[PDB]
Design a protein around this ligand. Structure first.
Ligand SMILES: *[C@@H]1O[C@H](CO)[C@@H](O[C@@H]2O[C@H](CO)[C@@H](O[C@@H]3O[C@H](CO)[C@@H](O)[C@H](O)[C@@H]3O)[C@H](O)[C@H]2NC(C)=O)[C@H](O)[C@H]1NC(C)=O
Ligand SMILES: *[C@@H]1O[C@H](CO)[C@@H](O[C@@H]2O[C@H](CO)[C@@H](O[C@@H]3O[C@H](CO)[C@@H](O)[C@H](O)[C@@H]3O)[C@H](O)[C@H]2NC(C)=O)[C@H](O)[C@H]1NC(C)=O
Ligand SMILES: *[C@@H]1O[C@H](CO)[C@@H](O[C@@H]2O[C@H](CO)[C@@H](O[C@@H]3O[C@H](CO)[C@@H](O)[C@H](O)[C@@H]3O)[C@H](O)[C@H]2NC(C)=O)[C@H](O)[C@H]1NC(C)=O
Ligand SMILES: *[C@@H]1O[C@H](CO)[C@@H](O)[C@H](O)[C@H]1NC(C)=O
Ligand SMILES: *[C@@H]1O[C@H](CO)[C@@H](O)[C@H](O)[C@H]1NC(C)=O
Ligand SMILES: *[C@@H]1O[C@H](CO)[C@@H](O)[C@H](O)[C@H]1NC(C)=O
Ligand SMILES: *[C@@H]1O[C@H](CO)[C@@H](O)[C@H](O)[C@H]1NC(C)=O
Ligand SMILES: *[C@@H]1O[C@H](CO)[C@@H](O)[C@H](O)[C@H]1NC(C)=O
Ligand SMILES: *[C@@H]1O[C@H](CO)[C@@H](O)[C@H](O)[C@H]1NC(C)=O
Lengths: 318, 169, 169, 318, 169, 318
């Protein structure tokens, strides 16, 4: 009579690593590093905007591509590569800082700044911003002199933020192709635009000169921005070459912005995103994208790290 | 027709538990799993799993742009910082798993010893170790006797006379 | 009036040591603490404490401002870096403590086994294990005899005849 | 006769965590994460300055609030929220970089730069910098034309750092409310201020324009700074709108600067600070403030992490 | 002329192995190393070494300048980030080594126990533990008999009668 | 008869650390933290350039010191402290970003930009750039008016990148010692230089003023740069004070740049470098230099961390 103590084993062993051994077989193991990607944007539960051709910064100035996003609202914001912030050639100064701000704004609320103008034109338009016909940024006003080569009067418009939240203020400086064109638009002489706040003092000057034609135009409108503290005031003194704002922006709340090239899915629910899709996983690590955002597992170089979920596998003596 | 235990041998036939008993008497050979030791091992392993499933509440947002690349200097600082942090987590992951696996394997061996030591202490002076993880029982042990060992109801006082007589003479 | 050892049982009455002896003879029941094993456990635990008390000489200064917020881009890079590093230390802290506790608990059990194995080796062939962490001594062991076991001066050769006679007959 | 081996236990067990279990009771445990805060600034052993209303950058230019700090010296520097760098409305360029420099300067030593002026006024003063009467920055000179609308002569002043340490040089550009006021102060024409070193070439121009009234003034004086290498020279060419320095600054040695809103304590001795007080602890981690500075335990998210200081607690079988 | 084992004693004379046998009989005293247990320990230790030798493929480039210092603000952010990361690796290094050493030492003790337990199981009922890591063999064991123990060919059935007779009588 | 089980020990024990003990003796231990440094630059296998007196940025503009490096090629690039980017006093804007770009460029390929000029001089030279006689940057052209005080005609030169790689374009703005010297060179009036691309719009103006004499000159030529996208165009409109480029730069491939003060060695093979030499080691950590670059072990504060390679050392009872 004899009784023996033993443990189970398999012929289907899987190798893992320890401090001492490399490739020690255990009975059962599971993966800790996620590699399985969902090539969609799981947007269930979150209000989602697919900006598409509308650049994120475009939602503030308002080119034709962003007309449906002038006062958008979202929990998740999606940027597309084909997106564009401009119609008339140009770019933002501190563009990325502004993007990072709008990606978690929860959208924007626009408010009239209430500027009125006397002895000038405000109907500056272009073929690059087509909307039925020639037009301009929906939130801005392209100011001119009045006839052609005419003198642009010195002005001083101001706006106060009467709200409990900071106001996003944006204006533009126009850079004509030539001093001839700058004169044709705003009259002769050196133009100056100064912007004053209670913690901001920047100054601006047009830089007329020949440049490559973007969409057929060598002119450049470049936008600048500041945040207006509650109850504070901004003041715009200028004599031409100034792209005035019509409305200010107020941040709605909280959101998250991503860049992606894959479709949206409203039935799946995710919280970690990258440009190639959504990572849904309870695994502690992932090897899909280092720049993944949201609430994600830590990124690692390794594609696989097996965690033993069983004892050491010792084959039965045949 | 000899049977052997864990001292160098797994049992591919034991399929309803991690640890178990294998006996042979006049009634024949038999194999049964031990519940308590098996569950203890499973509880500790799943305990690690739940511990590594604990998600984080730290949310991270974009700091660079893969459509319109940011400025070089701040861009390189970012890439340098990210890669540095990636090195850290890759190290931590590698070490964590390696450390856990060493412990998972060790605690599994520990449970096996505990079970073996329990049975040894049950049999008292009525059995001797054969060195393969088996006990040579020096008395008649039918299926009911063998079952009494598995459920820890083996009274060594009952067989002590018969056993010590066979061990010595 | 039965006593039991560590195999499933702590002693809330043992209040002057971590590990100890509990005996019963004709003189009655008694409980004493073992110094050497208790101090060894305390030395290793305090060894960990001193190891985690070791302060750092790295001094850090301000890189942002909570009165006048710095520029957005460099500000977000800073917050992203800090939060990333905070995730790392939070992980390290969690893991360190969890790892230490597993070892502290294990080495404590180890000391208990070592003490039990020491006593078993002292008694040689004059006692048998009852399976509860106790030894059934097969000879007369008065208080002085019991004390001889605690201070490792038990000469098994003295009681070997009397003991083996009671174990067999 | 029987002898039993055992271990102690309690009914007062405390739960900790391991790799396997969560809430396993041990006999004794201690905390590793500090949460106990001292709502004061422990300044014993360290020479401490409580700048209060004096902004740190103000110690260089010298508004009235910083008159007692023009040549301060400390081991610990404390910034207060009510602090201000200015009297006449304005701000520093690269303000934070300069702050970080002065926080570990150990204080400043001032030296006369020895500028002398001919056909102008140097007594530019204002109501915003009141000191008995109308005054100005104690370390600076507000230069004017001489009478009103008068011509401001072109000038060129230079200063050499004859010391073994870099010199902190600060100057200001005045931005008048209008070209009328700029003309009233420095005369007509476009003003230019150029600053030359041996590794610095920046240029500056006034930006007159209407701005919100800070303390009743729409004018802005904005300060700029550079570090002058030993034996090197700075040169100031200008024709108005220039806030000249009278003295240069030299860093005393080593210190640490903090921002706080709690009182100073000279009897307690600390080395880790935050805005809410001092963290005195031998614990490896803390959960009080992530931005804590000095020599501090690592910050963690968790409020508590119990370290077992005793064996597993197994209750006695009753 | 007494010999003792591992229970409190290393052997500075054992110079051709980590673990070994030391015997004394009528033929005299002798010491031999055990190959299998020694190699197992060496394999695990070198296993750690190879594991810590694994180089990284992450390449890092300059982000600051020690000839012409970069701008202060971005410079301090860089120094703050580097020093923070240095703190992390310094911690990891300290912890890794400390953790490995604790395990290296423990697994070494484990191998010693396994060898001792193997020999105990070989001798069956023909020997008793003296408590110093030695076995008192209760029969005649010449050099050939001692050699049979080292190479695991000791048949306890051969000496069982002679041994149990000397243990009891 | 008796057989004893034992383990080996030595009188030559070495102390290591564990979780519990500090200074526990083991039989054998090895070092994990490298401190052994090779005070040379191991360049075997890698094409190496020791720029010496040639500053890295100098390879683009081409002072005399960099004439042998105008189209260099390397796998490893070495900067020396005595290196200089300039002959005529001045500095680059965004210098460090540009350095980081060239350190991994694998060298540069130069291409003629093909600018031609009409009613001006292009032979602007100086004593600071001596090459046999007075000369200038080999890749640039110092433009003047034609005689002295003469009028500098307005111009507009353009260049297209007809290659599949971005082009490095560099130009300079000259800052004369005085408006008198600026007039002597380019004639009277306010000079303007505008640079136009399809994602770049910067403007530039000379800042004439007195400055310390570097190498006997108070004038400053400061360089600016942009990357020209494939098939895109840059346009230079100007009327003086403009340092025009003659050739554009194209990155060869991949390399690594270091700063060092120790000799090159072509027989040793390394992959981790610092200013003091090469770290060749299989050890996981190092305590030599935190700013070490290439493929290196992690830097740590500790000089030594002993890893036990043997059991605990227990002395034999004598
Ligand atoms: C080999 O190891 C794996 C991993 O531990 C074992 O697979 C695991 O099996 C359990 C139960 O079958 C799964 O539990 C599940 O929990 C979720 C909770 O969200 C529940 O929804 C499921 O219905 C299920 O109860 C567990 O997820 C699963 N793990 C993986 C990674 O698939 C497997 O059982 C082991 N092999 C053997 C033979 O036991
Ligand atoms: C439960 O665990 C705690 C933590 O280990 C034990 O408290 C500790 O007790 C010791 C001695 O009573 C304290 O040592 C002290 O060292 C400092 C050195 O600065 C000295 O100034 C003190 O006079 C004292 O000697 C130790 O600080 C203390 N730890 C804590 C966190 O308070 C406690 O003893 C354990 N429980 C039992 C019942 O032992
Ligand atoms: C004490 O510990 C050290 C470290 O483990 C032992 O030194 C090691 O000895 C081995 C063999 O003598 C060396 O292996 C070598 O591998 C390289 C592979 O690149 C090969 O080229 C060599 O010819 C050699 O085979 C190993 O490098 C060496 N380690 C160190 C750090 O020097 C030493 O043996 C131990 N002491 C005793 C008494 O065993
Ligand atoms: C708001 O701004 C006005 C000036 O527009 C100022 O007089 C007032 O003090 C500010 N604060 C409040 C609470 O009105
Ligand atoms: C950051 O890393 C990504 C991934 O390789 C690279 O594409 C990008 O160019 C890097 N950023 C900069 C500024 O070089
Ligand atoms: C950095 O984090 C703090 C803490 O939440 C936050 O108040 C601050 O706004 C952040 N910085 C920036 C630039 O957003
Ligand atoms: C110091 O500066 C002077 C010019 O002011 C220069 O001639 C001299 O070489 C410099 N160095 C020393 C050591 O004087
Ligand atoms: C970065 O640290 C180094 C090493 O101490 C120091 O020399 C340098 O000045 C620091 N950088 C800045 C911008 O202070
Ligand atoms: C290249 O640039 C030209 C203008 O120089 C433009 O017409 C053309 O569309 C661009 N692309 C290709 C592929 O030629």
């Amino acid at each position: 009579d004899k009784i023996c103590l033993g443990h189970h084993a398999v012929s289907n062993g899987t190798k893992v690593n320890t401090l001492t051994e490399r490739g020690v077989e255990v009975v059962n193991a599971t993966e800790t590093v996620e590699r399985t990607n969902i090539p969609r944007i799981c947007s269930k539960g979150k209000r989602t905007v697919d900006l598409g051709q509308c650049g994120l910064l475009g939602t503030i100035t308002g080119p034709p591509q962003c007309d449906q996003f002038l006062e958008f609202s979202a929990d998740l914001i999606i940027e597309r590569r084909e997106g564009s912030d401009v119609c008339y050639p140009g770019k933002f100064v501190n563009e990325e800082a502004l993007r990072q701000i709008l990606r978690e704004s929860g959208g924007i609320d626009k408010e009239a700044m209430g500027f009125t103008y006397s002895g000038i034109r405000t109907n500056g338009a272009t073929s690059a911003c087509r909307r039925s016909g020639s037009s301009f940024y929906a939130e801005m006003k392209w100011l001119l002199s009045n006839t052609d080569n005419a003198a642009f009067p010195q002005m001083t418009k101001s706006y106060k933020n009467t709200r409990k939240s900071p106001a996003l203020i944006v204006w533009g400086i126009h850079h004509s192709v030539s001093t001839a064109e700058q004169t044709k638009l705003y009259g002769s002489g050196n133009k100056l635009v100064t912007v004053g706040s209670s913690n901001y003092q920047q100054s601006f000057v047009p830089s007329p000169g020949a440049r490559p034609q973007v969409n057929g135009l060598s002119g450049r409108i470049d936008f600048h921005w500041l945040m207006l503290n509650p109850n504070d005031t901004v003041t715009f003194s200028f004599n031409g070459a100034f792209i005035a704002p019509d409305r200010a922006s107020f941040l709605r709340g909280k959101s998250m912005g991503i860049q992606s090239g894959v479709q949206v899915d409203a039935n799946c629910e995710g919280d970690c995103y990258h440009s190639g899709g959504t990572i849904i996983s309870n695994l502690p690590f992932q090897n899909i994208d280092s720049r993944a955002v949201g609430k994600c597992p830590r990124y690692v170089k390794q594609r696989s790290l097996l965690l033993a979920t069983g004892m050491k596998n010792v084959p039965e003596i045949p | 027709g000899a049977i052997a235990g864990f001292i160098e041998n797994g049992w591919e036939g034991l399929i309803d538990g991690w640890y178990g008993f294998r006996h042979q008497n006049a009634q024949g050979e038999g194999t049964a799993a031990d519940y308590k030791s098996t569950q203890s091992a499973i509880d500790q392993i799943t305990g690690k799993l739940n511990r590594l499933i604990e998600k984080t509440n730290q949310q991270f947002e974009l700091i660079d742009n893969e459509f319109n690349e940011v400025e070089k200097q701040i861009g390189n600082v970012i890439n340098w910082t990210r890669d540095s942090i990636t090195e850290v987590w890759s190290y931590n992951a590698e070490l964590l798993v390696a450390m856990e696996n060493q412990h998972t394997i060790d605690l599994a061996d520990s449970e096996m010893d505990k079970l073996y030591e329990r049975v040894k202490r049950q049999l008292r002076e009525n059995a001797e170790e054969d060195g393969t993880g088996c006990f040579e029982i020096f008395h008649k042990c039918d299926d009911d006797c063998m079952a009494s060992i598995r459920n820890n109801t083996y009274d060594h006082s009952k067989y002590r006379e018969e056993a010590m007589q066979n061990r010595i003479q």
